[PDB]
Amino acid sequence: QNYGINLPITGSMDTAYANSTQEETFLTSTLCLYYPTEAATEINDNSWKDTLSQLFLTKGWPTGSVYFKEYTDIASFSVDPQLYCDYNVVLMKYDATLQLDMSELADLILNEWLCNPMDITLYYYQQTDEANKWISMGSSCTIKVCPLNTQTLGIGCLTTDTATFEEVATAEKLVITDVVDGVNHKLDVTTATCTIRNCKKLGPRENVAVIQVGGSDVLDITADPTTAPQTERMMRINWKKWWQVFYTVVDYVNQIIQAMSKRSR
Amino acid sequence: QNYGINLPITGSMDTAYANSTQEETFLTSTLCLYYPTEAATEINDNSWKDTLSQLFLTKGWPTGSVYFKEYTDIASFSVDPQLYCDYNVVLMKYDATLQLDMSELADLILNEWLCNPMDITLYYYQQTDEANKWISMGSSCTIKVCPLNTQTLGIGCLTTDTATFEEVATAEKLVITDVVDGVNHKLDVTTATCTIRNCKKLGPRENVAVIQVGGSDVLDITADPTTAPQTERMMRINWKKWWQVFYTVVDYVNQIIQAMSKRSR
Amino acid sequence: INLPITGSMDTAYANSTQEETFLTSTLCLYYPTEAATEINDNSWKDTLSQLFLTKGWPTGSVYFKEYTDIASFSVDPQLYCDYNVVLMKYDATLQLDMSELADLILNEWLCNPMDITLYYYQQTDEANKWISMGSSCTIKVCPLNTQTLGIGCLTTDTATFEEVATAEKLVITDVVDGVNHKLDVTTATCTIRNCKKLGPRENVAVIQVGGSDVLDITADPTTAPQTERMMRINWKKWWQVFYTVVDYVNQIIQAMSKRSRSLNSAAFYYRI
Amino acid sequence: SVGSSASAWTDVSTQISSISTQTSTISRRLRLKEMATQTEGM
Amino acid sequence: MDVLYSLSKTLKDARDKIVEGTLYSNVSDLIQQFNQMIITMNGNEFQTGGIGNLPIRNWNFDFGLLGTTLLNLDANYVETARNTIDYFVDFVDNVCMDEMVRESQRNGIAPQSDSLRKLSGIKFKRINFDNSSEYIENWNLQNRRQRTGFTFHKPNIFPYSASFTLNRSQPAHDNLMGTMWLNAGSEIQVAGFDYSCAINAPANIQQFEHIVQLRRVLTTATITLLPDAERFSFPRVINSADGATTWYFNPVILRPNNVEVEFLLNGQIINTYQARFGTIIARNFDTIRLSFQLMRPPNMTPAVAALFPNAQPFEHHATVGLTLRIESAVCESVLADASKTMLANVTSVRQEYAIPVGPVFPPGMNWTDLITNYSPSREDNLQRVFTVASIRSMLVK
């Protein structure tokens, strides 16, 4: 029962397959849907949560293990998304005017981050690798960054004249900032309405599953423009209503939870 | 030092992996970015070029090896693109009204064409194999084709009444025409404004890297409607600003140069 | 390819590649407007094509590309064909212009651009020259010493420089190889590039339609060579010229040879 | 390490016969031995 | 050498036949031979050693004969025989260990390990009993020139060579035509690979030919020929010719059509097999020519058509393979096998007693660099050391 330590784990190829964890994990686990206000609006019903729970009960998920958690907008959801459940599913609308915001949302929830804090007024910070990004939440973040040279002086900017800085965010609720890795950047942020955190991307978060309800799969999780991956828990639907979407989610719940795996942390 | 010959090569599997050529090719080669005027407009900084060069300096490229070359629009760049560097990067905006134009631009710069001239007035041409196409450039092209039968007469068109011809282009700056391969065609083209060349498609140009800064991957390099490939040097990005895009390029330039390989010709 | 070739002397001569290189290659004549004017016809191109069709060259292989004058052609010659023939007239005033045209098209150049206001360049070997094209290139040069000061010129007063080129559309400047020069040029009209001469371009073929052989390809005044694809004709008309060309085209293409270096539509390679 | 154990004098690299390559690479450091005073002759 | 083999054979037959209870009618001849050996030996002083960690031992032979007085054997006879045999046995073992570690480019057959030279005289020739072994029979034959042969099972005639040949290449390594091969021991796994699947070639066909030139002729070879070489048939990241860059190889296997395997001799063909797979024969051959083809499938279902497009990307690479294992063979010269231990004995003796590299055998006796240049000096010395190694393994395995 050793914690905080990693050892080898041996095995063999003559072992047999154990009984299915399904029909017991469904009982001992919980499943939390994150749907938009548009769905409740187009539905106009007060018992649809109980309806979907009684439906899930046919797939085995008991009545008290299934939770629903509305979110008024993708941005208001990207503002501190607190996903605390044993199996999280998210339904995400498509909006070309919010492509990067709903890609940053994915890059934040699909992945697992180790977030240390930042003190802009005191220190000047830098990145070290291709996974050490700066994640800023809040109501409206206006970020500006001035790179520095070897002698702690600006490069195309002035350490005092803040208006010379380079604005990489204009009133965004969630920003993921990647800058040149190997130089010290001085930041200017509206720290009264936004909190910034120096976050390192660890191995992915296997507990969530995004479902783009609309257009083609555009989400570029990885910053580097060479991978453009598409993981197993990044699904896509074409839609005209929401009852069909929810019935499809229900009918294919088992596949979703097969695509999802409980966390290792 | 034989030229213009193909000789057998030999090798082995016992040789060791030599030291890395990055940080030596970065010095003994050149880099050339192509950006849209929209970026300089949104930026409004007269020192961003020297700033980005000083940032590249950290990644290895010296100061007098990087070049920025503006271009007003995708079509105005497609008109006679004279790329001469050792590593070329192109930024490209997404516009559904320009899908085919900015796919033709890709099919032109990404690939390597062997281009002979064309004399519309005298000759009636044909395509031999699936890789002989007719690429036309200029300020505004208007191409009209008429196939012919075995006895040099038209098929749904009249060799005198040009109006009877079929219109494949309408006021286009760049056109790539693939017609039925094996029949003699007559053409009418406004040769005052546009030049048309009969080109043959060869192995790819490994020197250029296109970066679609916007919506989903639509670029169909290959004209056959079966492959629809996405290559290594065909990238996608989501954006809301431009400083962030250039910082991304600068931080992941080594990946770009790993996805690109210097020319063979 | 740096690997070696091998062979033998007992192997036999294979069949003729002529009568197939015609089928799988293209030819491109570059004639002057004077010819079209003297002729005063419209289907002479179709005539020459139907004539070529007997010598083997098929219909859609021959091309005729007009040029108004030697200098207009010299300004950025865009030769892109598998076989290029050029007919060029004789003029004692344009002697050097149409020797520089020869030096440019007959030979293959590797060109790097130049930034004059910000830098000062020199030459290294006997084959690194400076080629300037455009409407009118008026170049002046001032050599310098190790400590950036003038030799027989003043770095400020442009009027003290040494004017090597006065109102020329194509200039090929060779200066002393080893010293740093400062240049004054009409950048608004002309662009000047530092170009090293590679091996010859075996894809083109010049034909001096007039007087004696004057072309000095190599800038050194010791060689004065006469290459294979540099012909001479005497003329009183142009129909006789074109008929001679057509009747003796196989010899022209036997004196030419498709390139080896690479595919490129310019008359010189660009490598920054 | 072409030898008993790791020695910076015997670390072949930048190979752009195997024994011939190894010997040439090891000999390109005896020029440094020369002006490091571990020689005996002229 | 023949007298050494006779010594070893009679000592072996003595350790075996001369056992308690047995009958004198079975060992009369062997006892006479043992007594004659003792007679011809008694009165000579031998020295062995003086190279590496081999210690300088001295042998002085003063032994007594065996009285032909009994009918059955008792322990008082066997024990005398054993205390006379152990000395000769360790003497022969030390002689062999001193002879396996000596070389010469000048008359390698001519003996070394001067005790053995002394034994090669004419006063010792009365010891010969029978030259029955294969190696010693071939030695006697080669001395009295005649057609010899060593029968080998899975001979290691091929030196390890794993390498490719690219007849069409680019810096990016995106459209390639070539052949990879691994020739190791008794097996050749060859595979030609085209990334275009022969879309540009005449009749949609691309040829490949592998020419393997052995150093020594073979005879009566039994061979197992199969398609679909296994080790060049899965994804790979291979290095360039110059070892600087790397390239990817994602193969998809096809069958060789118009396959042709030709066993030649001095450029003259000897055997030719066209479209026969499995077990085959080769009566005499120095060169092997394996010539196969990659023929694009004229009729393709969608699943396979999606892999061979008419454009340059080519993310699946068509391959055509051939495995060829030489199971048995018969060679006029000496080699290594998977049946016999002589090479192991030799290399083990040298690695144990720390022998400096000689002027003939390469360091560590690496069979690869020993068969890459199978010079006649190396061949003679290898035959000599293998013969004496057999002679030693007949006593101490």
Ligand SMILES: *[C@@H]1O[C@H](CO)[C@@H](O)[C@H](O)[C@H]1NC(C)=O
């Ligand atoms: C799991 O299912 C198999 C197949 O029916 C069965 O043999 C096994 O007993 C089951 N395991 C348990 C723990 O019920």
Ligand SMILES: *[C@@H]1O[C@H](CO)[C@@H](O)[C@H](O)[C@H]1NC(C)=O
């Ligand atoms: C590559 O790295 C190795 C290990 O540090 C070094 O020995 C070698 O010199 C390097 N290559 C070059 C060209 O410096």
Ligand SMILES: *[C@@H]1O[C@H](CO)[C@@H](O)[C@H](O)[C@H]1NC(C)=O
């Ligand atoms: C070469 O010419 C000879 C004589 O006309 C002819 O027999 C032969 O077939 C020709 N070669 C080829 C490849 O056709």
Ligand SMILES: [Ca+2]
């Ligand atoms: Ca955002």
Ligand SMILES: [Ca+2]
């Ligand atoms: Ca970064």
Ligand SMILES: [Ca+2]
């Ligand atoms: Ca600024």
Ligand SMILES: [Ca+2]
């Ligand atoms: Ca177009």
Ligand SMILES: [Ca+2]
């Ligand atoms: Ca019509």
Ligand SMILES: [Ca+2]
């Ligand atoms: Ca076509």
Ligand SMILES: [Ca+2]
């Ligand atoms: Ca001139």
Ligand SMILES: [Ca+2]
């Ligand atoms: Ca002066």
Ligand SMILES: [Ca+2]
């Ligand atoms: Ca000069």
